[PDB]
Amino acid sequence: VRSSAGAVRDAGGAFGKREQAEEERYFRARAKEQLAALKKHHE
Amino acid sequence: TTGRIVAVIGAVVDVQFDEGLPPILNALEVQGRETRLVLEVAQHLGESTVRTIAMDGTEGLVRGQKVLDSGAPIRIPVGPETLGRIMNVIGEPIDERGPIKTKQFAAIHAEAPEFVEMSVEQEILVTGIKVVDLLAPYAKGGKIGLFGGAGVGKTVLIMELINNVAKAHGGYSVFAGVGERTREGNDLYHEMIESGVINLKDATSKVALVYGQMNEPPGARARVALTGLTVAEYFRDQEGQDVLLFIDNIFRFTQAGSEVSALLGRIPSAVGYQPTLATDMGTMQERITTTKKGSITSVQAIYVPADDLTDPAPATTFAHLDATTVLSRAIAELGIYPAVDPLDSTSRIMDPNIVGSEHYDVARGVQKILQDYKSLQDIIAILGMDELSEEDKLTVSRARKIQRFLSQPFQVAEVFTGHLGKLVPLKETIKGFQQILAGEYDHLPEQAFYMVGPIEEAVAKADKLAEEH
Amino acid sequence: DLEETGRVLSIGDGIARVHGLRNVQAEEMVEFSSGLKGMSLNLEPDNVGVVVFGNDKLIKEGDIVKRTGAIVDVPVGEELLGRVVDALGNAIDGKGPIGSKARRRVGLKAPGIIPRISVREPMQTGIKAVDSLVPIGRGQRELIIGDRQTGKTSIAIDTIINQKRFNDGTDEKKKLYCIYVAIGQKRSTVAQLVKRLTDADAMKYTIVVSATASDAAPLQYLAPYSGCSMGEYFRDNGKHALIIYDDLSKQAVAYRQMSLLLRRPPGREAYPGDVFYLHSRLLERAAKMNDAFGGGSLTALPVIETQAGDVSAYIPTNVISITDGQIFLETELFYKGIRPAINVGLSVSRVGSAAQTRAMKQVAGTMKLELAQYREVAAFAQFGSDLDAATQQLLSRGVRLTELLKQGQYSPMAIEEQVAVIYAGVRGYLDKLEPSKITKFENAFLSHVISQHQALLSKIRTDGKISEESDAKLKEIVTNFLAGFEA
Amino acid sequence: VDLEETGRVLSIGDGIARVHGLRNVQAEEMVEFSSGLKGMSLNLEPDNVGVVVFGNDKLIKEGDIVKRTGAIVDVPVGEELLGRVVDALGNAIDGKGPIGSKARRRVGLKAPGIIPRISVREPMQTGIKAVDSLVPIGRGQRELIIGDRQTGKTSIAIDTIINQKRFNDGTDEKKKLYCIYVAIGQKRSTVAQLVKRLTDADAMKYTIVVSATASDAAPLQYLAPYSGCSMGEYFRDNGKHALIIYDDLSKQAVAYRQMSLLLRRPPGREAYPGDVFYLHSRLLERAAKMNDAFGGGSLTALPVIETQAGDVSAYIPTNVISITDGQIFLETELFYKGIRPAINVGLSVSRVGSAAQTRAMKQVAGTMKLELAQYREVAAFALDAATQQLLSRGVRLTELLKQGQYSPMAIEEQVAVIYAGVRGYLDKLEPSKITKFENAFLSHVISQHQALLSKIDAKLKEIVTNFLAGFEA
Ligand SMILES: Nc1ncnc2c1ncn2[C@@H]1O[C@H](COP(=O)(O)OP(=O)(O)OP(=O)(O)O)[C@@H](O)[C@H]1O
Ligand SMILES: Nc1ncnc2c1ncn2[C@@H]1O[C@H](COP(=O)(O)OP(=O)(O)OP(=O)(O)O)[C@@H](O)[C@H]1O
Ligand SMILES: Nc1ncnc2c1ncn2[C@@H]1O[C@H](COP(=O)(O)OP(=O)(O)O)[C@@H](O)[C@H]1O
Ligand SMILES: [Mg+2]
Ligand SMILES: [Mg+2]
Ligand SMILES: [Mg+2]
Numbered sequence A: 001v002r003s004s005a006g007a008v009r010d011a012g013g014a015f016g017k018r019e020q021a022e023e024e025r026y027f028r029a030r031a032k033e034q035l036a037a038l039k040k041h042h043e
Numbered sequence B: 001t002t003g004r005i006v007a008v009i010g011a012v013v014d015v016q017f018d019e020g021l022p023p024i025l026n027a028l029e030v031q032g033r034e035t036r037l038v039l040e041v042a043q044h045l046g047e048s049t050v051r052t053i054a055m056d057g058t059e060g061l062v063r064g065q066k067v068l069d070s071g072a073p074i075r076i077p078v079g080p081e082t083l084g085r086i087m088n089v090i091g092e093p094i095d096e097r098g099p100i101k102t103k104q105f106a107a108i109h110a111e112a113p114e115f116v117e118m119s120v121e122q123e124i125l126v127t128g129i130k131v132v133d134l135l136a137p138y139a140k141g142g143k144i145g146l147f148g149g150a151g152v153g154k155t156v157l158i159m160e161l162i163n164n165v166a167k168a169h170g171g172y173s174v175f176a177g178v179g180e181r182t183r184e185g186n187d188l189y190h191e192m193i194e195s196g197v198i199n200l201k202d203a204t205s206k207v208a209l210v211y212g213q214m215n216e217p218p219g220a221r222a223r224v225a226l227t228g229l230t231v232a233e234y235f236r237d238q239e240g241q242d243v244l245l246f247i248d249n250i251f252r253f254t255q256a257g258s259e260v261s262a263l264l265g266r267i268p269s270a271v272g273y274q275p276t277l278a279t280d281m282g283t284m285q286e287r288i289t290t291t292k293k294g295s296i297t298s299v300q301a302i303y304v305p306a307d308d309l310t311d312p313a314p315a316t317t318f319a320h321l322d323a324t325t326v327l328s329r330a331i332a333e334l335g336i337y338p339a340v341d342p343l344d345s346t347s348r349i350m351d352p353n354i355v356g357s358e359h360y361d362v363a364r365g366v367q368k369i370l371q372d373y374k375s376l377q378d379i380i381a382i383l384g385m386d387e388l389s390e391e392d393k394l395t396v397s398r399a400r401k402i403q404r405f406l407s408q409p410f411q412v413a414e415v416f417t418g419h420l421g422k423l424v425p426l427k428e429t430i431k432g433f434q435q436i437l438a439g440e441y442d443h444l445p446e447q448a449f450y451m452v453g454p455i456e457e458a459v460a461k462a463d464k465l466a467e468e469h
Numbered sequence C: 001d002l003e004e005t006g007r008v009l010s011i012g013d014g015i016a017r018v019h020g021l022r023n024v025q026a027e028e029m030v031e032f033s034s035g036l037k038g039m040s041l042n043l044e045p046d047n048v049g050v051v052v053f054g055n056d057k058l059i060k061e062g063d064i065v066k067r068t069g070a071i072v073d074v075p076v077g078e079e080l081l082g083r084v085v086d087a088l089g090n091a092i093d094g095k096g097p098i099g100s101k102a103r104r105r106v107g108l109k110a111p112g113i114i115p116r117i118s119v120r121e122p123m124q125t126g127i128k129a130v131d132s133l134v135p136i137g138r139g140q141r142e143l144i145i146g147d148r149q150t151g152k153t154s155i156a157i158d159t160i161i162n163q164k165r166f167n168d169g170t171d172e173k174k175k176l177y178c179i180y181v182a183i184g185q186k187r188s189t190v191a192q193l194v195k196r197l198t199d200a201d202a203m204k205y206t207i208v209v210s211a212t213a214s215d216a217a218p219l220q221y222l223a224p225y226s227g228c229s230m231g232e233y234f235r236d237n238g239k240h241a242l243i244i245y246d247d248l249s250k251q252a253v254a255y256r257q258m259s260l261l262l263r264r265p266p267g268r269e270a271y272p273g274d275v276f277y278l279h280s281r282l283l284e285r286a287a288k289m290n291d292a293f294g295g296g297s298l299t300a301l302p303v304i305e306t307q308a309g310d311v312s313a314y315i316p317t318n319v320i321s322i323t324d325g326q327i328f329l330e331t332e333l334f335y336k337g338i339r340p341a342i343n344v345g346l347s348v349s350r351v352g353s354a355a356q357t358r359a360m361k362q363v364a365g366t367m368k369l370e371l372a373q374y375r376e377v378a379a380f381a382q383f384g385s386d387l388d389a390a391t392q393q394l395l396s397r398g399v400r401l402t403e404l405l406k407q408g409q410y411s412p413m414a415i416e417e418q419v420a421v422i423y424a425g426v427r428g429y430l431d432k433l434e435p436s437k438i439t440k441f442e443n444a445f446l447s448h449v450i451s452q453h454q455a456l457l458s459k460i461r462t463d464g465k466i467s468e469e470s471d472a473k474l475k476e477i478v479t480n481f482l483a484g485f486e487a
Numbered sequence D: 001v002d003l004e005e006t007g008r009v010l011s012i013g014d015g016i017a018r019v020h021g022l023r024n025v026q027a028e029e030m031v032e033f034s035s036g037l038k039g040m041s042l043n044l045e046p047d048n049v050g051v052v053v054f055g056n057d058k059l060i061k062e063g064d065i066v067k068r069t070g071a072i073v074d075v076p077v078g079e080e081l082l083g084r085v086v087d088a089l090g091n092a093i094d095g096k097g098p099i100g101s102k103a104r105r106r107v108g109l110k111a112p113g114i115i116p117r118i119s120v121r122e123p124m125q126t127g128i129k130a131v132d133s134l135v136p137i138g139r140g141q142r143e144l145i146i147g148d149r150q151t152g153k154t155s156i157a158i159d160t161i162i163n164q165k166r167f168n169d170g171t172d173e174k175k176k177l178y179c180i181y182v183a184i185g186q187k188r189s190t191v192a193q194l195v196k197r198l199t200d201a202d203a204m205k206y207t208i209v210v211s212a213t214a215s216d217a218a219p220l221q222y223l224a225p226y227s228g229c230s231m232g233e234y235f236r237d238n239g240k241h242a243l244i245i246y247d248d249l250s251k252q253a254v255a256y257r258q259m260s261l262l263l264r265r266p267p268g269r270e271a272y273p274g275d276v277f278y279l280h281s282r283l284l285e286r287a288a289k290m291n292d293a294f295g296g297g298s299l300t301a302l303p304v305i306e307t308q309a310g311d312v313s314a315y316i317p318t319n320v321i322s323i324t325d326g327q328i329f330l331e332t333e334l335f336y337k338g339i340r341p342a343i344n345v346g347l348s349v350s351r352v353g354s355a356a357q358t359r360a361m362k363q364v365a366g367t368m369k370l371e372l373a374q375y376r377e378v379a380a381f382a383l384d385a386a387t388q389q390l391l392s393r394g395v396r397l398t399e400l401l402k403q404g405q406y407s408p409m410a411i412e413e414q415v416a417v418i419y420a421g422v423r424g425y426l427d428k429l430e431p432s433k434i435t436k437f438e439n440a441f442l443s444h445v446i447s448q449h450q451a452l453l454s455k456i457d458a459k460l461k462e463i464v465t466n467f468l469a470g471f472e473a
Helices: A016-041 B130-135 B154-166 B182-194 B218-239 B251-261 B277-285 B312-320 B329-333 B358-384 B390-405 B426-438 B454-469 C129-134 C152-162 C187-199 C217-236 C247-260 C275-283 C312-324 C331-336 C357-376 C376-383 C391-402 C415-427 C435-452 C456-464 C470-482 D129-134 D153-163 D188-198 D218-238 D249-262 D276-284 D315-323 D332-337 D362-374 D394-398 D411-422 D434-447 D459-471
Strands: B002-009 B013-019 B026-030 B038-047 B049-054 B067-071 B075-077 B106-107 B141-148 B172-177 B207-212 B243-249 B296-303 B323-326 C005-010 C016-022 C027-034 C037-043 C048-052 C065-071 C071-076 C100-103 C143-146 C176-183 C206-211 C240-246 C297-305 C326-330 D006-013 D014-022 D027-031 D038-045 D048-052 D065-072 D074-077 D104-107 D144-146 D178-184 D207-212 D243-247 D298-306 D326-329
Touching: A016 B358, A016 B390, A016 B454, B013 B038, B026 C435, B026 D038, B049 B106, B049 B218, B067 B075, B075 B218, B106 B218, B106 C275, B130 B426, B130 C100, B141 B154, B141 B312, B154 B172, B154 B182, B154 B243, B154 B251, B154 B296, B172 B182, B172 B218, B182 B207, B182 C217, B207 B218, B218 B243, B218 B251, B218 B323, B218 C275, B251 B277, B251 B296, B251 D276, B277 B312, B277 D144, B296 B312, B312 D332, B358 B390, B358 B426, B358 C331, B358 C435, B390 B426, B426 B454, B454 D144, C005 D065, C016 C065, C027 C048, C037 C415, C048 C217, C071 C217, C100 C217, C129 C357, C129 C415, C129 D144, C143 C312, C152 C187, C152 C240, C152 C297, C176 C187, C176 C247, C176 D298, C187 C206, C206 C217, C217 C240, C217 C297, C247 C275, C247 C297, C247 C312, C275 C297, C275 C312, C297 C312, C357 C391, C357 C415, C376 C391, C391 C415, C391 C435, C415 C435, C415 C456, C415 C470, C435 C470, C456 C470, C456 D178, D014 D065, D048 D218, D074 D218, D129 D411, D144 D153, D144 D315, D153 D178, D153 D188, D153 D243, D153 D298, D178 D188, D178 D218, D188 D207, D207 D218, D218 D249, D218 D276, D249 D276, D249 D298, D249 D315, D276 D315, D276 D411, D362 D394, D362 D411, D394 D411, D394 D434, D411 D434, D411 D459, D434 D459
Parallel strands: B141 B296, B141 B323, B172 B207, B172 B243, B243 B296, C143 C297, C143 C326, C176 C206, C176 C240, C240 C297, D144 D298, D144 D326, D178 D207, D178 D243, D243 D298
Antiparallel strands: B002 B013, B002 B067, B002 D038, B013 B049, B026 B038, B026 B067, B038 B049, B038 C005, B075 B106, C005 C016, C005 C065, C016 C048, C027 C037, C027 C065, C037 C048, C071 C100, D006 D014, D006 D065, D014 D048, D027 D038, D027 D065, D038 D048, D074 D104
């Protein structure tokens, strides 16, 4: 009924902290792939 | 005419007068003091007795001690002679440089400009700060508020604004230190001498300083903002140049009034505040304004106790502003500076008829992606990242690049990090976010967008990181 | 003469305790030696407690205070139209004195049971989401509610601007005079508001009553009742008025200040016990009068600011319980692109259908159903693949109808135009179209029907319904427009 | 009775005498009761003085004579207080005879203004690795220690005092730091354990202990922080450096609340006086760094605040957070998890740091700060696939910031241990062993490699890995 998007992060609760770590894990693995692809585009 | 002290209770002093009773707001001078002690009349109690609030400590006061009615409210030096100087609540110099030899003085109490004196002009004031200029831009001659809990970055932000705006300003600036740290007054003073903004060897200083910090009793703290705005008012009305007014921190004006409210005989209102919180703020805030006579751009740092934006003090402040920069602890804890909340900072000029449709469309597109991102984070908390659709992962990827491109190294923060401050022109800010949202940098890691200036520094940062890989 | 005059015993925080005035009435206007006006609110055995309608800093122990003999009142009539006044009805626009023939007590009793009749005339906002889903009728009290900066004032202002269409015309029954009461706002905000209304040429049928943030508390407390009495002049003389209270949160704070300083017993959130009664007597004065009493009406749009969306707070609780419904606005919806940011699920009009034209009643009825069905499945769109085509139908309809509820600022729509775009959605002429293209389609389709089908739009207006001939006509227009849409 | 200089008690109850007469008495003047007690005139009213009694108010009776002293409340100050335990009025309570101080200072003197001050420039070294590396404190700063009961707050303060010996025994005068511990509301046996700890460490010789314990009258507990502060200000203003600990300001506010309520000053938020903010803001503003024209001296403050069930958003905690330059946040969860000292590194903040915290410390802690911030972002993972290379370094570093009690460390000793972790030499060692490793490793370096701890990174770099390799057997 009432809008509530982002409430999980907003609580700083276990679920909140876990999701933050899960995003970070994903995007650090992406960065590794993207920096290598950028290295091989370098020549 | 002469009165006699009859009671002293903390900051509250009662004085009885045999003949002429001083009107409310009158400044009274306590006799037999080593340094000047002003009592400001707050109430007529009856039986020829007034209740007053002291502007300095009341230690050493004796019942029967004499008090002279000055005949007027607190009056302070105004005009060119305040420039480069540091003054008290009551207009005394506190820079140890000697008397302030002004021709002109002004009451710190005054009526707010009338409805007919209002200006409707609205023009963007570019700061070079990406988040601000993009999402909640300031207007010249506008009222700006910087909200934030403790240690989130209000003071750093206000100093960057003094660095960006006030150092390119053709008119005069006023800074009022209200209820903050004395050490920060020292920092600001010596910083401005170093940068030549205050010039100690001639008449060319372009800033006036007024301080009443947290070491001071609540009377001084409750009135210092008025002292600073009085200095600004003179410049606005009597001279032809635009004025800048910076105040750190205006919450402390409201807090100071709550500190004496019970001793003045009031029943407390909600959250322990004085019943007059809103009207007291109103009579002060309504003077801080551009008029048909002249323009004041006001920037006020606003403390949000315990990060609670619904607290009556900052809650009541919102109605007084044209642009709000809302700082957020969650954002600062992610390492994003300035820690501006992109979904809680606003501006009356964020309107396509004012900033243009391109600016407006990019601002609202950025906000849309960040808002959609919030819904996705709830899902991720259960599902994880890998399980999201390719479309959602793309919304997350882009929203994260946007969050980080909103961060920016401040010149004034070159002390914390060692990284050089950056100023980003408006059109460059719009272009960069346009390009991120359009998907033009889907191939770079999000870290490339963290703590840079223009979009070209991100492309270049990605190149350094590729080599170090 | 201690019956007709008195002297100030004490003064502080805007309360003057006065010796004498033995013959003063409760709620009488009194005058101080400087020229300031006051109101006698506490009649006590040895003093009168007077609240000051101005700068109470100018009052001193011993000052003479005199009776006026009159219960607090204000000017009323057509001479106030086009004017900005303060809470006492004095001009603040610099355009000279209000040429007022009549005055009205600010605190007059609401009409009772008998004079009224059920709300049955449309009060059109020109806002699609409101006129279709939260419809307002003449005489209704409809709350606009939400946190700071969700679009509350913008609802009220677009509504005021919308009435020009009627006020310019020849049908006197559809005319609506407007009153905007600003309470506790800063002066530069009100000036921008007035600029807007002037630019729209809406000031000519509007009264602005303003008691701003630096105005003494009794003035902010008084302003809604003053504006209310202005509207009642129209209600009682067979005319129709709309009144906006922007906002009642600020009025209650001002009242709480006066009450606490008068040392009246404090209650929840330090509000006095009569704070409910403050708002109930104000909003019950909005009414729809029956023909035997002139036929007129007063419609009220009070505005409440919530904090973190807490409708259980004391003042929002009171006002929700008083009014006939609420339009609820939300920051999350606003930034998602739902502008105006109306939460349809949480919004209600308890008058409902009775305040709508038949034409709207047609299309709105189905749109309400399909959005309510969609709102139950809405989460499944963002993550749900292997779902049956039945729930896929609800999601496709829903996301598209949702786009039709979006509306830019300062562009209120004629009822016929709303029903033409809503008809397109509810008859399924958008179902094969991309959601990103719905607003482009709406704008294009509206331009097309306005440019070359005025006769169809006119008849739907005049008749107030869609006939079988009208529906067959509109059926073909949408079909042919849609067929050659993306050039 | 001379009614200008003397008065008689009208009524006496719960530490408050209402006194007739004393017409010439000043606000905040010390008075003296015929029974020997002292008091302070706080409430000057038309028909009476509200006197707040500095001791057992139960000895006072209606009718008793009260006399002016003519003096605003003050305390003895000077180096004669060093090595002594005193009450809130500066009287000896250690049984070692009178204080021979030739100087006194008012307790409520204004903090230095803008002009007499200068940018903080010198390190205040705690000898605690987590603080000195990550939350470094400078001289003139105010750093709050805040947390629930039994999170380790006092322990930080005591280790810091103990650490100063290495400087105070030195020949470099500018590095010396005189310490003041103010105990407010504590029981006497706890203060006794404290001075015993300080004495065993040879730390009492440069420390003043000011004690206003739980059975001392409310005014004495109110006054204690200001008395201790005056004693520090004597060092501040005479070209020397002092550190003051207020343990704790929660208990001082409670005493202030009692006194004020019984004076009949109306109760504010949580029944606290309206100016409880000011009570603390005026105190902490007195910690300052002085410019050379004023002597170059400094006073640093470590106030202590007790939270309830982790509630930092509480009234008094929020006040003091908003005053201080930074804060060290301690948490029960961390304490019991094995993180001792129980510092929340993520939340704990200190103001920049003079460039000078050190220089070789700036090196290794610079990389640790970066490495732990990146760790904190993934820490919450605590099965795991490759998220474990993301966890490795950070987990080791977290173990290296653990530290026992009463053994504060030299900066070079801290650098040497942090180095071993930061250069990735423990990345394959069982994280549970690191505690055992550090102690053993550090003992061996202290004993046999004292030359390596010298000048505090070319020869040093090669020589540390020489030990670390062979050691990690
Ligand atoms: N339908 C709309 N489309 C786009 N923008 C809108 C719309 N309605 C309002 N806005 C914008 O939203 C902002 C806030 O609107 P408004 O001032 O009406 O909100 P409010 O709830 O009255 O806030 P306040 O707390 O300032 O009183 C304004 O910049 C306004 O231009
Ligand atoms: N670094 C540490 N390692 C191991 N134990 C510690 C450490 N610091 C403190 N402790 C222990 O934890 C207990 C509480 O410490 P301390 O007395 O400093 O906490 P506190 O927060 O001041 O509590 P309170 O003031 O409520 O008694 C003591 O037994 C102390 O020995
Ligand atoms: N723009 C910024 N860049 C880097 N660090 C910042 C920035 N803003 C704030 N900080 C950090 O936050 C601390 C406190 O900021 P400050 O402005 O003093 O907070 P407050 O909001 O209490 O005034 C700074 O010392 C710094 O560590
Ligand atoms: Mg600050
Ligand atoms: Mg509004
Ligand atoms: Mg302890």
